[PDB]
Structure formats: structure tokens, C-alpha cells
DNA sequence: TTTTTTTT
């Protein structure tokens, strides 16, 4: 008898795996009998225990194969090929709904019975976020629309404020929400060529704490970033395709993604200021700090950074109508679950705690 | 029974697919029964639903194959070979005649039964562009002739003007129309080597916002742009072939394509000034801004950036005799459709609104 | 008759052999008769003598294969695949538990009957380390807990004090205990990128001997390192993911490991001071120096450098419940062995000798 | 039945086709019935219509093969091998008379029954070019002989002098005649080293407008060009064989071809100036401009760039005995055809119109 | 029946072909009927006509092979392997022995039955050479044996004296008979590192004219060469191995080869002087300039810096016993020719013509 | 083996 390459390709597809080693190592685990498989029995990893029993017989024959890496290479190509197809054919709206469907699926586990997460802790995080800026949930919705529409020369938001004002915290959550990559452009102009390479097929990008010059007036360290960015104004404008590069790999040509720039309080060339559609001023606030000092499970579990938290905020605040049609059914079910588990008074009590700088809980 | 490599190759010719992963991805979709293929039923992508029923039988056998990437590679080579043959044997006029047929096919879809494009919005865009400069349609015809004739050392048009003058917007539409590439020359002088290698077999090129000097007086921060271009006089002149470069590939020798450069008003060594056969100067004009500020669907659908819009302009403004004979038939049908779909009064109403800076529609 | 690739892969898994050439060389040795094998008879290397008799038959056929390196590559891939699976799935507590099992296996050999080590000399090592700082064993337990929880901000420890005050000694033993890498941030800012690349997939990092500035007032040579660290805030706080680079490789994105910073008595910015959960002062003490003179078998055998010594310290001092439940069984057996071989009076006599600055043994 | 790789390789030889993609594309055209082939019917391309009938049967079987690129790779190597064998064995005269036969074969077609351009125009181009400098034919005959004899140090000719002197125009015609290569050195030495590899197996080379120094007083930017020139003096002198480079392929050592190098009026190291038997510059004669401006089919059809124009000029001006012996049959035959279609008075009419600076074809 | 790979390998060995393309090309020529092979009839190339008849049948089958380049790659490996064996095994004397035998075969070419350069035009070269300076044949023989023995310290001679003195001209000529290279030290030490590192595996070496700093007081330009070489004690002495280095390459270890230093009349430290066996100074000579001016055929066929002209000078002056013991056969066989064809009077006439500075071939 | 890294 012979290996079914088809079943391996299915497993790669269903796990959305695209590392040949991870795929290989995972598939090899199935060669022992699932009936005693302690990973199955302890229900430790779904990407194992869902599949072991299905794939078992083929895994045993695969364990004898002399071609093992070639089989995995073909499977990984298929997963990569599907991403390529999607990049050229989905609407930006559909991409976002797909991404949301995956987060919602992860939320299904986290707050499941096997779910380790305390939904009350995660809901506490939403209170702290809704304090960080005026009209926070409206700001998120405006950003999401901006990213979907991707209007040329109206594509980039500037975050600036003192050190320790939560700008990278907020960027992290948006980036996990949408998917994308961070970039560092405080660099020499040569390595920069490969640095920009990682934007390929990404949805967002974030430029992390770019450095101005002469900021030592405000005691800011000076550096490359701003002067270096002004050369790349084309990539911001997104008005035409550009050519992007990776190590040992020939170029690809695409429009450079929309995104966010984070910055200390340097000044900026208005040639670049003109390219930011919007600017948000962050500020340190004492009650956030004193609340947070008394609420450190927020930090310990990274709740405040995580896109799951922003999604929960939108589900709480926004009308069902604002979500694209197919996910509205899941959105309604989560809304019901949230309202069942939390009164408004409980949420308002939490917000009042944050304002009072006590620990969020009481 | 065995895979027809011939049928795969034929699909790649039919679709003009260049990427082995994109080819692989799309051919796999045909493995499921077209009898119920939701993509077919929803009529979403022409390159799928036209072909699924035909290729289904072969795709089922391809889905089992162990060679898959090899079969796709040969198919992609066949498409690339056809481009090489065409590049060496067509007149530039035939190349453009082919390009127009492809756009016209896309227009037949866009405004066809599936009809996703509103021809009213698209024609409103034509009025906006025809307003952007005097005698706009005449200027387009001049540029096309210049690119077709490709007279040596009379090959390049310079666009100069301040920010938001619209020069990029015009250049973007022209690039789509002819199918060129955009290139960045403000980079360091080394990886220009792999950068300019993108121009292999291209019809047209545009260099974007070439960073010069002297403009620091006016807050144009300077760079290698003008330095690098004056280093490349022969590439502009197209007087003799040059070598071009790609990773893991030996050099290709050919004449460098004609085209366009965009400039905020840095200084220019007159060794470059000699080589631009023409320069056009652009100016911001507030009433256009007030127009877009209401008619924002122009930007959101990117209408004013598209070669599709320029093609519609030419069909409106030019004699049928200016077009190559083989398409004059298709041109006549589109002229007829346009006269049916719009009265001159409607177009005059639009163009009046554009001049008023009110929203184009009323 | 055929080679069993399976038996090779099993050997590679059991030896955890990462390198193809090392794997190849060792397997070939088995082709001679284990029954006469001098290396077996002299019990020189466990990775040989445990295995020779089992693999002999397959090694004989392997010796005639024409595919030899191909067999080894597939085997080595299996070992690498296992590591990446583990990296993405194990808890940090699981990782540490595995690491301890490895050390315990080496100790079983070292102090075995074949064992060349002397448990008494190695216990003399523990007495010296326990004198290096107050409450040494509690300090280790605290450090380990901090690494396992990896709580944001609460992640990094500072070792401070003069030259030859022992800080590097303790760093090295901890680094051996946990596994990890040393890094040197005194470099000029451009080279740091590949330097930090070393951190990829590590459990710990140690920053060696970061040079401040202006400590030359105290004869300390000045350097960049302190400023470089103050510019790496997110790497230390560990709240969000970071991109990391290696030579000829594409970047990977992960949370930067926790770790240790070591320095002489440079002044430290408050911005940097706030990064550290804890600071430990090392001071030179003469009685340790005079003891080391008279007890230099400690240095010669590198006892005081080794994680093996720290593990013995944990076994002697900590309650059994403090260890991960699985290994508690082995821990009891080692505690029992140590209790048998040393009365507390013997151990305390050694501690007294170190306090005298006299030789440890009497 | 199976593909004849032999018949494929014959086509590659007889086309002298030298690119694997071009060859692949070309041969696949033959898979259709030649009996109805539109290209055959058009007599569109000789390299098709001469061969379609002969290769049809083999091309049909080739069209089904799975090895298609491998077949073409072997065929291409046969053509490269033939070139390398000629490269060493032939005398420089024997090479040149082969080159002339190829050009004569084109002219037989160009002015043939297909006749796609008319010798009156090309002869007018001869008149324009003979007008460009005194006794043009004689100066050409010197250059040809100098390149055949290839005397060291007395080996290269300079074209210094202003923009739009036509110096590049003359270089292009000579290079087309000789079948050399252009090369660039205005470059980093660490890619210059590999770029020169194109010099393998070339009769002649040309270096274009190389960046000197001192010319910055005349706005000519100084640069790497002349540094790289005055370095490699061996290559200029042709003093000894030296190595040359290719990707994924063996290097080669051989003497460097003789050549021309061109500049505008930079300064030049006398250490370099030593190495040039002729050291000439070129300056505008404005009436020719006014003629060309009124004779633009000359420039549009690139006639005054072509090598064909030089060969026509030599056929007119030179004695039959000045040519290599074997071709003198064809030389006489073409000398007839000129005289059969032109009086001297017609040629002199053209030349006075040119000298007068007026549209030629009265 | 099938291609003998063996026969191909014999031909490669017999012709000492290093290049897979040459081997392929030439071997394919044998496929045509030997019995009327017109290249054989013309006796153009021994590498063909000596072999075709033997290889014919195999070459026919070779031309039908589908595998051709693979056969040639193995054959080329055989020749390279042969070289690398001998390169490691043999003595410097054996190496020079074979190098003589090669260039004696080059004489058998130069004056074979085609006589394609006149043996006595070459004798006129020998005259100009021996007329150059005192006793030149002995000075050659001494320097040659000095370089063969490579005795420590006794390894470097100093060619002082002004420009155009011939010191460059002569030393370069010896390298034809030896291999080797010349190198630069007029440079700051960061260059000098790589510059020294060039010299790997050279049989002999030379230095560029030392522009001695500390010698500018003689009204001369300088580079750092004096302090450089005076510090480079070991490399000159050749008493021990040293390490050598190149861009992007690791170090290599060898005894630094022996050689020649050249300069104008610069200053020298007594220590740097102690590095040399001989001080020489050259000068331009009024007879010799006017002789070459009147004798330029010696330059035209590259005689005056050929090695063959030195070989003939040796075969003239030096007795048979002074040559490699078996090669002495050939020495007699050329003494036969030279002493037959040339009277001492024509030799003395030629020498006297150089002594009068007049044209040698009176 | 190119490439990326080195080199700069
Ligand atoms: N608005 C705020 N007021 C007070 N403390 C804040 C505020 N925002 C963040 N913090 C505290 O500062 C810590 C760091 O937050 P964060 O990393 O997002 O700051 P940042 O200023 O955006 O950083 P960076 O400029 O380095 O990207 C938080 O974990 C929290 O403890
Ligand atoms: N002539 C114009 N008058 C007013 N607004 C204009 C004009 N042209 C363009 N715009 C506005 O400016 C935006 C950007 O135009 P565009 O990028 O083409 O200008 P540009 O001069 O090429 O700019 P840049 O040098 O920044 O790339 C357009 O999307 C439109 O909103
Ligand atoms: N507390 C101590 N008192 C006296 N001597 C010490 C002490 N600790 C270490 N030593 C001596 O110092 C030597 C070096 O130890 P170690 O490298 O750990 O010192 P360090 O302070 O970390 O130095 P550095 O910062 O230079 O690496 C040890 O081998 C030992 O001889
Ligand atoms: N006698 C002339 N009078 C006027 N223009 C001339 C004359 N000869 C040549 N030119 C012009 O020179 C233009 C460019 O020619 P060419 O590129 O060969 O010159 P060049 O000196 O090599 O220039 P560059 O230094 O810019 O490369 C031609 O298009 C031609 O019109
Ligand atoms: N002694 C001589 N007298 C006259 N002409 C000579 C003499 N030697 C060589 N020549 C001619 O002069 C040319 C230059 O000689 P060469 O470069 O060898 O001299 P050099 O002294 O090494 O010069 P430099 O120190 O300037 O590099 C030779 O190639 C030859 O044509």
C-alpha cells in the first residue's frame, strides 16, 4: 500500500499550516495509536486531538516513507498557493470578515468549558481601553473603515505623545485584530531594503517609534526615521504598485499596505504631515497608572495588548448592522452571551473603578 | 489514467498566468464538481467560472499527482516564452493594439450583465480628468504616439509641479493604460542593479518623485534621485542596448523602455534637461478639490487613477480612424453605446458641475 | 536486503543528534562487531555503548548503502521537526522540566560506578556557591520562578559589582542550568541586528558586561552599551513581539527572552533602572580568594561554573514539593542518595572551612 | 513515438538561437498545421516560415513532451559550444567576414521582394552619415583594420566631447557592424568585477560616457567611472588574458576585447591617456540638425544608428579588393545593385541637401 | 550501442581541455564523416585532425545522446583532478620542467610548418633582449634558479632606476614562463591587508614601483610602501608560513612566495635593504628607444615581453646541461634549428643594429 | 552558488 499525499494536503489545509517542519513534526505524532494517545486523552491541542484518529492509518505508512520531506513540501505549497489566490481575489471587506471569523473561533475556545480565560478579566480590559481615549469604540470603527476603503493618500494615522502613553499598546491590539507586521525604519538605508520586504501580502503595517532629529530639545534621542521616511512618501501614498524584496528571492510588485506611525513628540516635515489623514495625541494619566498598579493581572495575561480585547469592545458597543452580513449571526450569539453574563451596572461599576484609580474589580 | 500537461498549459495560456503559485492555486479549485461550484453559481471570477466545467475532469487527476509543481512550472514557462517571442517580433503598435483589446474585454465585464461598474460614475471621472489640463485628450494622443514611435533620445516626458498637483494621478492612469512599471531611483547606487532589472520586456516605465537637490531652500529634502538619473543617460536615450539583472539569473540585454518622470521642483543638471523631449507643469486648483470633496466615490473606487477612465476619454474624444484597424470595430460599438448611455447635455451638466467645484452629480 | 531508515531515525531521536555529519559518523562505527567492540568494552561513550548491539545489523547494511547522506538528512530532519513542535506547544514549566531531566541523566553517569566525578568535590562546590551571596538557594528559586512566569516588565535582573566579584561565574551557571545565550551590546549600533539575532528561540539571554560612560572617573573604560540598552525598551519589558534576524535568513517575530544584565559600577539612568525587577550586588571577599587557592580542584574541574552544581544546591536545599510533579520522584531518589553520602555535620564543616578561608576539605 | 532532440538542435543552430525561452516559444509555434498557418501565408517572419513545414511533425510530438525545457537547454548549449569553438579557432578576419555575411543576408531580405524598406532612404542615410565627418568611409576602414590587427596599447579609440555631438550615434553603428557589446563602469568595483564577465567571447566592446572628474567645473559630475578605467589598464592595452565571470556557471580567462570608450569633457589621468591610438572628439554642425529635423524618417527608422548604413557606405566607397576575399563576389553583386538604382548625381543631390541642412528627398 | 564515456575522457586528457563548453563543441565536430572531413583536409587544427578518425564512431552516437553535458562534465573533472594531484605532489623543479616543455611546444607552434611568425623576427627580439643590459642570459639564469630554490631570505632582488627603464617590461615577461603576479604597497594599511592577501598560490611574485614615503625629499610622490615593507619582515624572508586574506573570504596559510621589488631611485632603510640579495638599477637608453622605434614588429607580434623570446635567449646562450635533464633533448633539437638557420654574423649584425639603436632586421 | 554578508 502507499501514502496518500491527498490526506496530508488535507491536514495542512485544515490546520492552515505553512511551515514544512511544523507540518512534518505534527503529522509524525499520529503514527502511534490514537487510542492511547495521551495528547488526545488530555485534550491538550485541538490541531492534534481532532485529527489523530482520522489520519492515523496514513501516518503509519508515512512513517515508513523514504520521501517524507518531498510529501510535506507539496502540502505546504498548497497552503501557500491558497493565500496567493485569496490575496488577488477577495475584497478587503471579505478578508476582514475571514480574519474576524478566526478570532471568534479562538474566542470560542478561550471562553469554552476547556476555556481557561476568565471573561470577567477580559471584560475588565475593555473598560481600561475605553478610558484610554475619548469615544474609543468610535475611533476603532473609523480606523477599520479606513483600512477597508484603503483610499490613496488618505491611508495613514499618526500616533504621538510622551513616553508611556499607550500608543504601542494600542497599535499592538489593532495589529493583532487586523493582522499585519511591525517595521523599524530607524536604520541604515541598505538594510532598509530587506526590512520593507516583510510587508508582502500583509494587511496592515505599523512603523514603530520613528526617530526625528533635534528632538534633544525635548531630550529625545535623535535618529534616522523621519528623514528616512520622507524618502518613502510613495509607499505611504499607495497610489501605485511598488517592488518588494526578500533574501535569496526575486521581487514582487504590489501596493504597499495602509497602517500606523508611532512617534515621540518630534516635529515633522509637512511633506509628510500632509500624508497623515489623522493624528491622535496620547497623554499620560495618573488614574490609569494607579488603577493599573492595582489590576496587574491585566498586564500579566497581556489582556491590554490583545486583539481579542478590541473585538470584545466592538461587540459590546457597536450595532449588529455594522458587521458584514455573514458574521452577524455569530455576532448576535456573542452579544447575547455577553449580556447574559454582564449587567450594564457591572460594566459601569468597572469604568467607575478605573476613573477612581482603584483596582478595576470590587 | 494520467494528467494532461497539455490541458494545464492551455489554461495558463488562456488566463495569461505568470505565477506558478497562482496557477497552482486556481487549477486546484477545479477539482470539486462544477455542478455545484458556488463560485460558478455566484459568477464571481471570470477566470474561474468560464473554465471550471472544461478543466474539471483533468483537475481531478491533477489533484492526486505527485509532480504538481513541475507540471505548473512547465505551464508558466510556456506563458513566459510567449511573452519573449512577442516582445521580439511584434511592432510596438501591435503590442498596444493587443493591450487595448484586454482592457476592452475588462470593460465588457465591468459594464456587462454582472455590471458592477456604474458607467455614469466612470464617465464623471472622464470629465474630471479632461478638466485637469487644457486639451487633455490631445495630450494623451501625443504621448501614445511618442511611446509607439520610440524615437531615440526623444523618449521621456517630465512632470513638474508642487504636491497634490495631480501629476502622480495622471501618471498612474497612463501606466495602467500602457502596462509599464514604476521604479524608485532615490535608493543607493548599488541595488539599482536588481531594481532596474524589473524593466525587462516592459513597454513603459515611470520614475517617481525623483529626489534632487537645491529644493532644500523650499523644504524638498534631497537625495540620490537626480544624481542617479544623470548617471543613466544612456538608459534614457535608448540609443543602445543595456544589460539587465535578476537574482539567480544571468543578464538579459535589451533597449530600455521609454516613459515618464515626476518631480517636485528640485534642480536639474541640463544633461538631463536635454533628454526630456517634453515637460508638463501642473498646478493645484481648489475647485477640483471642492469637487472631489463631495464626489468622494471617485477616489474610493480609484476611478480617476485608472487607464480604463483614459480609454473612455479617448473613445469619447477621438476619431475612429486614429485607432488601429482591427479594433476600429470594437471602438465603433463603444462609441454607439456611449451615445446611447449619455446625452451631450448630461456630459455638459457633469463638466459644468466639475467647473463649479460642486459635486459632479445633481 | 534493505536498510531500515526507521532504525536510524530512532537512533537520531534517542541521541537527539542534531548534526548530519555527527549522526553519520557515529552510526558507521556500529558496523564492526559490538561483541568485540573496544569502545563498548571500555564503556567510553554512552551514545555508543548503549546502542551498538541494537543497531549492529542495520549498520552493516547501511555501510553498503549508496544513499548514505540521504538517509541521514531525513533522520536529522525528524529531530529538528520535533524541536519546533515542542517550541510552539510546551509550557515554559514543561520546558524547564525537560531541561532538568537532561541534567539528572548526566549526573547519573557522572556519579555512577563508571562515573569519573567525585560527589564530595561537587558538594564542596555547592558549599562555596552558597557562600557567594546571602540566601543563595532562595535567590535561585526566585530567579527560576521569574523566568518561568515571564511576566511583562518583571523580567530582568541586574548583577552589579567590581571585577573578579563572581558575577560572570553565577551567570554562566544559571545559563547552563536553563540554556540560553550570551550577547554583547557594547557593539556599534549598526551591528546589533545580527547580534540580537542570536536570541532566536532561546530560553534565557545574558548581556555581558555592558559598558557605561563617564565611569572613567572611576577608571571604568567607557562604551556604548548602556545607551544601546536604553534604546531597547520593548525587548526588555517583553510586552509585545519583536522581529529578529539571522545571516542569510528571513526575519522571525517573537517575544524577546528574559535574562540578566551584568556590569561593573557604572552609573545607570533611571529609565533603565525601572526596567529591572531586582538588583544584586556582588562584592569581592578575601576568604573566598584564599579558600580558592587551597581548593583549586574546584577551578580545575570547572565545578563552580556548572549548572550541575546549582542543581545539586537546589536538591539539597529545596522542599520536594517545589519541583514539577513528574520529576519529584527522581528528586526524592537523589535527596536520599545525598542524605546517605553526607551527614549534615560533614556539610556544615565544609561551610565553616570556607568561612575560615581555609581549604574546604579536612 | 518520441521527440527528435536532433531536429530541435538543428533549428537552434540554423536560427543561431541563443536563449532557452526564445527557442521554446519559437518551436511551439510549429505544432499547428503549417498548411494553413497564417504566419506562413503572411511570410511574416523568416525564422518561422522557412521552417514550419519541415519541423511540423517533430513539433507535434514535442508539444506533448514532459521534458520540454531540458530539450531546449541541450540545444542552446550546442549553439554556445559552437560559438566558443569559433571563438578560439578563427582569425579575427575570418570572424569579421562571417559577420558581414549575416548583415548581407538581412539586406537581401530588407530590400528584397518583401522589401519592407527602400534603399533610397537608407542611401540618403548613407549620405547624411558620410557628411558627419570627412571621408567617413576611410576613417571607418582604419577602425576596422585596427580592430582586426588588435595591436596592444595601440588598441582603443576615445570619443571625448560634448553632448549631441553624435559620438554615441557613431559608436552604435560601429558596434552593430562589429557585433560587440556595450559595457558600463560607472559603478561599484564589487559589481564591476562581475559585470565585465559579459566580455566573454566578444569581438569588440564600447564603454559609454564614463564619469570622469574635473568636469564638475563644467557641471559634469565626477564619479567612479574613470577610477575604474585608469585601474584596469591591462584590459585596455590587451596586455594579457584575465578572468571573466558568470552565474551558476564556470568562469573563464581570456584576453579582453579591444574597444572604444566615450565621455564628455572630464579630465583624464595621463596614465590612462597613454593607452589610445586615437583620441578624438566630436562637435555639432547645426545644418545637419535642420536637415534631420526635416528628414525625420531617417531617425524614426533608426537608419543613422544602424550598422547596415555603414555597410552600405563601405559598399559604395571602398574598392572590392579592400574586402576579405571570399565575400568579394557578394560585394560586386551589391555594388551593381547600387549603381543599378542610383546615379552619382542622385547621391550628390542628397549630399548637397544634407550639407545645405534641408529635407533630402526632393 | 552506446556512447563510450571512456573515449571522451581520453580526448579531454589528451587535449587537456578544462572547459565543458569547449569539450562539447569540439567533440561534436567529429560526428560528420571523417572519411571526407574538410577540416582534416585543410590540416587547420591538430586538436581536430589528429583525433577525428579515431573518435568518429563514438562521436556519431554522442550526437544522438540525450545526456551530452553530463558526459562532458565528468570528463572535465578528470582533467581538473589530474592538475590538483600534480599541483600537490610535484617539486618546483618538476613544475618548471613541465612549464618549459609547454613553451617549447609553443615554439613548435610558433615556428611549425605554418611558420606563422618568423623565427628570425623572433631572433630580432632575442637580439633586443640580450642587448638590453649586462650579460642578460646569465642574469636570467641566476634569477631563475634563485626562484626555483626559494631559499629563505635569499629571495628578493631590487630593481631601482627611473621610469621607462624597462624594469616593469622585463619582470612581466618572466611570468609567461612561470606564472605569478605583481602587487601594490603604496597604500594605507587597511588596503595593504587585502593587497598582501592577493598573493596566494603564486609561483613567483613582483611589486609595483615603491612610491617610497621618506623618499619624497628626492622630489618624488609617495605611498606608505617603505614603512610597509620594512615592517613586513617575514614575508620577504619566507622563513615561516604566513596568513593571507581576501574580500568576503577566509584566511589561507602558506610561505610567502619569492619575487622582485621595483622602484625609482627612492630612499631605503638599511633594514629594508637587508631584505634583498641584489641591488639593480635600470635606465632608459638612447639606442634602445630608437631601436624599438625602428623595430616595432617586435612589439607588433608581442615578442619583447613574450616568454618565448626569453626561452630562445636561453636556448641560444645556455648550454644543454643547464636545462632540465630530459628536456635537454628538445634543447639540442632547437639548438640544431637556431644554429643552422642563423649565422652568428646575422645574430651579431642584429645585436650590432641594436647597439647602433637602428632597425634590427637590416 | 548565488546570495547575503562583507566591505565600506
Ligand atoms: N496613558 C497612560 N497613562 C499612564 N500610564 C500609561 C498610559 N499608557 C500606558 N501606560 C503605562 O505605560 C506602559 C507602557 O505602555 P506603552 O508601551 O504602550 O507605551 P508607549 O508610550 O506607547 O511606548 P513606546 O513609545 O515605547 O511605544 C503601560 O504598560 C502602562 O503601564
Ligand atoms: N490639480 C489639482 N488641484 C487640486 N487638487 C489636486 C490636483 N491634483 C491632485 N489633487 C489632489 O491631490 C491628490 C494627490 O494627487 P497627486 O498624487 O496626483 O499629486 P502629485 O503632485 O503627483 O503629488 P506628490 O508629489 O505628493 O506625489 C489627489 O488625490 C487629489 O485629491
Ligand atoms: N566574591 C568573590 N570574591 C573574591 N574573588 C572572587 C569572587 N567571585 C569571583 N572571584 C574570583 O574572580 C574570578 C573571576 O570571576 P568572575 O568572572 O565571575 O567575576 P566577575 O566579577 O563577574 O568579572 P567580570 O565582570 O570581569 O567577568 C573567579 O575565578 C575567582 O577567582
Ligand atoms: N552635426 C550635428 N549638428 C547638430 N546635432 C547633431 C549633430 N551630430 C549629431 N547631433 C545630434 O546628436 C544627437 C545625439 O547624438 P549622440 O547621442 O550620438 O551624441 P553624443 O555626443 O554621444 O551625446 P551624449 O554625450 O549625450 O551621449 C543626435 O540626435 C543628433 O541629432
Ligand atoms: N631601457 C630602455 N630604454 C628605452 N626604452 C625602454 C627601455 N626599457 C623599456 N623601454 C620601453 O619603454 C616601455 C616602458 O618600460 P617600463 O614600463 O618597463 O619601464 P619602468 O622603468 O618599469 O617604468 P615606470 O617606473 O615608469 O613604471 C617598455 O614597454 C618599452 O617599450
Curated annotation (Swiss-Prot), chains A, B, C, D, E:
Annotated region Binding to host TP53 protein: the residues are 72-362
EC number annotated for this UniProt entry: 5.6.2.4
Q: What is any one of the record's Gene Ontology cellular component terms? A: host cell nucleus
Task: Tell me what controls its activity.
Answer: DNA helicase activity is inhibited by ATP-gamma-S.
UniProt-recorded Gene Ontology molecular function terms: ATP binding; ATP hydrolysis activity; DNA replication origin binding; double-stranded DNA binding; helicase activity; identical protein binding; single-stranded DNA binding; zinc ion binding
Residues that, per the record, bind ATP: 161-168
The free-text domain note is:
The J domain is essential for multiple viral activities, including virion assembly, viral DNA replication, transformation and transcriptional activation.
Cofactor binding note of this UniProt entry: DNA helicase activity requires Mg(2+).
Superkingdom, natural source: Viruses
What more is known?
Answer: The sequence shown is that of strain 776.
Protein name in UniProt: Large T antigen
The organism's taxonomy opens as: Viruses, Monodnaviria, Shotokuvirae, Cossaviricota, Papovaviricetes
PTM comment text? Phosphorylated on both serine and threonine residues. Small t antigen inhibits the dephosphorylation by the AC form of PP2A.
EC class name: isomerase
Amino acid at each position: 500500500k502507499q501514502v496518500s499525499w491527498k490526506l496530508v494536503t488535507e491536514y495542512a489545509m485544515e490546520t492552515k499550516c505553512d511551515d514544512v517542519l511544523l507540518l512534518l513534526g505534527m503529522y509524525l505524532e499520529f503514527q502511534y495509536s490514537f487510542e492511547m494517545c495521551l495528547k488526545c486523552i488530555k485534550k491538550e491541542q485541538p490541531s492534534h486531538y481532532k485529527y489523530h484518529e482520522k489520519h492515523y492509518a496514513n501516518a503509519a505508512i508515512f512513517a515508513d516513507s523514504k520521501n517524507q520531506k518531498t510529501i510535506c513540501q507539496q502540502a505546504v505549497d498548497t497552503v501557500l498557493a491558497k493565500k496567493r489566490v485569496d490575496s488577488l481575489q477577495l475584497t478587503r471587506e471579505q478578508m476582514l470578515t475571514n480574519r474576524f471569523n478566526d478570532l471568534l473561533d479562538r474566542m470560542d475556545i478561550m471562553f469554552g468549558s476547556t476555556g481557561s480565560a476568565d471573561i470577567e478579566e477580559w471584560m475588565a480590559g475593555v473598560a481600561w481601553l475605553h478610558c484610554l481615549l475619548p469615544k474609543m469604540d468610535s475611533v476603532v470603527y473609523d480606523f477599520l473603515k479606513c483600512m477597508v476603503y484603503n483610499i490613496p493618500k488618505k491611508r495613514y494615522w499618526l500616533f504621538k505623545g510622551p513616553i508611556d502613553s499607550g500608543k504601542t499598546t494600542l497599535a499592538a491590539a489593532l495589529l493583532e485584530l487586523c493582522g499585519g507586521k511591525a517595521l523599524n525604519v530607524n536604520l541604515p538605508l541598505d538594510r532598509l531594503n530587506f526590512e520593507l520586504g516583510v510587508a508582502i501580502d500583509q494587511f496592515l503595517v505599523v512603523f514603530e517609534d520613528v526617530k526625528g532629529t533635534g528632538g534633544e530639545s525635548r531630550d529625545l534621542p535623535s535618529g534616522q526615521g523621519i528623514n528616512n521616511l520622507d524618502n518613502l512618501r510613495d509607499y505611504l501614498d499607495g497610489s501605485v504598485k511598488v517592488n518588494l524584496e526578500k533574501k535569496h528571492l526575486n521581487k514582487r510588485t504590489q501596493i504597499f499596505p495602509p497602517g500606523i506611525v508611532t512617534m515621540n513628540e518630534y516635529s515633522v516635515p509637512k511633506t509628510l504631515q500632509a500624508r497623515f489623514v489623522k493624528q491622535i495625541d496620547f497623554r499620560p494619566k495618573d488614574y490609569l497608572k494607579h488603577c493599573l498598579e492595582r489590576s496587574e493581572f491585566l498586564l500579566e495575561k497581556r489582556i491590554i495588548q490583545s486583539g481579542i480585547a478590541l473585538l470584545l469592545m466592538l461587540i459590546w458597543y457597536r450595532p449588529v448592522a455594522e458587521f458584514a452580513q455573514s458574521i452577524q449571526s455569530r455576532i448576535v450569539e456573542w452579544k447575547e452571551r455577553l449580556d447574559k453574563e454582564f449587567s450594564l451596572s457591572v460594566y459601569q461599576k468597572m469604568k467607575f473603578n478605573v476613573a477612581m484609580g482603584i483596582g478595576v474589580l470590587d
